[PDB]
Design an enzyme around this catalytic site. Structure first.
Site, PDB file in Angstrom:
ATOM      1  CG  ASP A  25      42.174  30.449  36.916  1.00 46.76           C
ATOM      2  OD1 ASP A  25      43.041  29.970  36.145  1.00 46.76           O
ATOM      3  OD2 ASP A  25      40.932  30.404  36.701  1.00 46.76           O
ATOM      4  CB  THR A  26      48.149  31.436  35.708  1.00 47.65           C
ATOM      5  OG1 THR A  26      47.940  30.058  35.344  1.00 47.65           O
ATOM      6  CG2 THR A  26      48.952  31.427  36.996  1.00 47.65           C
ATOM      7  N   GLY A  27      45.047  31.293  34.373  1.00 48.52           N
ATOM      8  CA  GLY A  27      44.334  31.283  33.099  1.00 48.52           C
ATOM      9  C   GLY A  27      43.138  32.192  33.111  1.00 48.52           C
TER      10      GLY A  27
HETATM   11  C1  LIG Z   1      39.435  24.398  31.282  1.00 50.14           C
HETATM   12  C2  LIG Z   1      38.616  23.549  32.275  1.00 50.14           C
HETATM   13  C3  LIG Z   1      39.303  22.221  32.544  1.00 50.14           C
HETATM   14  C4  LIG Z   1      37.322  23.776  31.731  1.00 50.14           C
HETATM   15  N1  LIG Z   1      38.556  24.260  33.549  1.00 50.14           N
HETATM   16  C5  LIG Z   1      37.953  25.437  33.802  1.00 50.14           C
HETATM   17  O1  LIG Z   1      37.344  26.225  33.103  1.00 50.14           O
HETATM   18  C6  LIG Z   1      38.127  25.822  35.290  1.00 50.14           C
HETATM   19  C7  LIG Z   1      36.735  25.755  35.856  1.00 50.14           C
HETATM   20  C8  LIG Z   1      36.787  26.177  37.337  1.00 50.14           C
HETATM   21  C9  LIG Z   1      35.396  26.168  37.973  1.00 50.14           C
HETATM   22  C10 LIG Z   1      34.439  27.282  37.478  1.00 50.14           C
HETATM   23  C11 LIG Z   1      35.129  28.603  37.837  1.00 50.14           C
HETATM   24  C12 LIG Z   1      36.377  28.635  36.976  1.00 50.14           C
HETATM   25  C13 LIG Z   1      37.399  27.600  37.451  1.00 50.14           C
HETATM   26  C14 LIG Z   1      38.733  27.687  36.757  1.00 50.14           C
HETATM   27  N2  LIG Z   1      38.739  27.129  35.432  1.00 50.14           N
HETATM   28  C15 LIG Z   1      39.844  27.446  34.628  1.00 50.14           C
HETATM   29  C16 LIG Z   1      40.085  28.888  34.257  1.00 50.14           C
HETATM   30  O2  LIG Z   1      41.458  29.281  34.263  1.00 50.14           O
HETATM   31  C17 LIG Z   1      39.437  29.288  32.933  1.00 50.14           C
HETATM   32  C18 LIG Z   1      40.199  28.717  31.738  1.00 50.14           C
HETATM   33  C19 LIG Z   1      39.841  29.334  30.441  1.00 50.14           C
HETATM   34  C20 LIG Z   1      40.635  30.288  29.834  1.00 50.14           C
HETATM   35  C21 LIG Z   1      40.238  30.844  28.633  1.00 50.14           C
HETATM   36  C22 LIG Z   1      39.059  30.455  28.032  1.00 50.14           C
HETATM   37  C23 LIG Z   1      38.300  29.459  28.604  1.00 50.14           C
HETATM   38  C24 LIG Z   1      38.651  28.900  29.810  1.00 50.14           C
HETATM   39  N3  LIG Z   1      39.439  30.743  32.835  1.00 50.14           N
HETATM   40  C25 LIG Z   1      38.293  31.432  32.799  1.00 50.14           C
HETATM   41  O3  LIG Z   1      37.187  30.862  32.949  1.00 50.14           O
HETATM   42  C26 LIG Z   1      38.354  32.938  32.618  1.00 50.14           C
HETATM   43  C27 LIG Z   1      37.412  33.653  33.507  1.00 50.14           C
HETATM   44  C28 LIG Z   1      37.724  35.110  33.402  1.00 50.14           C
HETATM   45  N4  LIG Z   1      37.095  35.745  32.556  1.00 50.14           N
HETATM   46  O4  LIG Z   1      38.587  35.620  34.142  1.00 50.14           O
HETATM   47  N5  LIG Z   1      38.231  33.231  31.158  1.00 50.14           N
HETATM   48  C29 LIG Z   1      39.122  33.967  30.478  1.00 50.14           C
HETATM   49  O5  LIG Z   1      40.041  34.608  31.166  1.00 50.14           O
HETATM   50  C30 LIG Z   1      38.900  34.018  29.012  1.00 50.14           C
HETATM   51  C31 LIG Z   1      39.847  34.519  28.125  1.00 50.14           C
HETATM   52  C32 LIG Z   1      39.630  34.497  26.752  1.00 50.14           C
HETATM   53  C33 LIG Z   1      38.374  34.143  26.255  1.00 50.14           C
HETATM   54  C34 LIG Z   1      38.144  34.128  24.875  1.00 50.14           C
HETATM   55  C35 LIG Z   1      36.908  33.754  24.400  1.00 50.14           C
HETATM   56  C36 LIG Z   1      35.989  33.304  25.316  1.00 50.14           C
HETATM   57  C37 LIG Z   1      36.197  33.195  26.638  1.00 50.14           C
HETATM   58  C38 LIG Z   1      37.432  33.646  27.149  1.00 50.14           C
HETATM   59  N6  LIG Z   1      37.675  33.597  28.505  1.00 50.14           N
END
Ligand SMILES: CC(C)(C)NC(=O)[C@@H]1C[C@@H]2CCCC[C@@H]2CN1C[C@@H](O)[C@H](Cc1ccccc1)NC(=O)[C@H](CC(N)=O)NC(=O)c1ccc2ccccc2n1
Ligand SMILES: [Cl-]
Ligand SMILES: [Cl-]
Ligand SMILES: [Cl-]
Ligand SMILES: [Cl-]
Ligand SMILES: [Cl-]
Ligand SMILES: [Cl-]
Ligand code: NA
EC number: 3.4.23.16
Lengths: 99, 99
Positions: A25-27
């Site tokens: 997960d690069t995000g």
């Molecule tokens: C965007 C959407 C389509 C909702 N997909 C998803 O969220 C899926 C859901 C999947 C199942 C649950 C477990 C996570 C995976 C991966 N993800 C994507 C995944 O890449 C997700 C995307 C993202 C980035 C930033 C902010 C919000 C959301 N990242 C994350 O959830 C990571 C988790 C972590 N702390 O390492 N969040 C962050 O790295 C992050 C960064 C900045 C922030 C600023 C304010 C608030 C929240 C913030 N969270």
């Protein structure tokens, strides 16, 4: 190897002696693993995503194998529906995004 | 073009004639953009991630530009704290994960 993104980029990992599936997960800033019985000292932490923050256990210096690559680093353990490998460990294994 | 992951993989996007910053996120099935006014038909959807679910507007066939690359696809508009480019658009710009 190179991974296209037509399907979720899921790989096998090894953690605490156990084989698991996880999402490259690069995000994600951090690595978060589903609730499991992991040895080591931890401390409580909040981590956030879409939908808000969850309470996790933060374990430092955890040895984890990611697609045959060893890495040592912070692992968070908590109520995620999916194991995710974040940038903190992707960098350790030399992962990059190319296009 | 190659992007290392020591920092958040952020790039400039153009959507609805406005410039924004977005994260290239191999862990996201869908592309989610912060609340904005976008012309087009849409329908409600809920999408889920780390702290749970948010309600979004689903727009199909949106023309968007990502790091200089043109794409046309579905965009979800809703209260995300970060704009995210998911796999539905990353495949169009030819992103791959290497490691
Ligand atoms: C965007 C959407 C389509 C909702 N997909 C998803 O969220 C899926 C859901 C999947 C199942 C649950 C477990 C996570 C995976 C991966 N993800 C994507 C995944 O890449 C997700 C995307 C993202 C980035 C930033 C902010 C919000 C959301 N990242 C994350 O959830 C990571 C988790 C972590 N702390 O390492 N969040 C962050 O790295 C992050 C960064 C900045 C922030 C600023 C304010 C608030 C929240 C913030 N969270
Ligand atoms: Cl797809
Ligand atoms: Cl113990
Ligand atoms: Cl800087
Ligand atoms: Cl509306
Ligand atoms: Cl349409
Ligand atoms: Cl056009
Ligand atoms: Na350009």
């Amino acid at each position: 190897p190179q991974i296209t993104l037509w399907k979720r980029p899921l790989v096998t990992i090894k953690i605490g002696g156990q084989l698991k599936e996880a999402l490259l997960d690069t995000g994600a800033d951090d690595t978060v693993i589903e609730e499991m019985s992991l040895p080591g000292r931890w401390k409580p932490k909040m981590i956030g995503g879409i939908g808000g923050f969850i309470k996790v256990r933060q374990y430092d210096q955890i040895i984890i194998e990611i697609a045959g690559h060893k890495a040592i680093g912070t692992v968070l353990v908590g109520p995620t529906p999916v194991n995710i490998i974040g940038r903190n460990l992707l960098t350790q294994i030399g992962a990059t995004l190319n296009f």
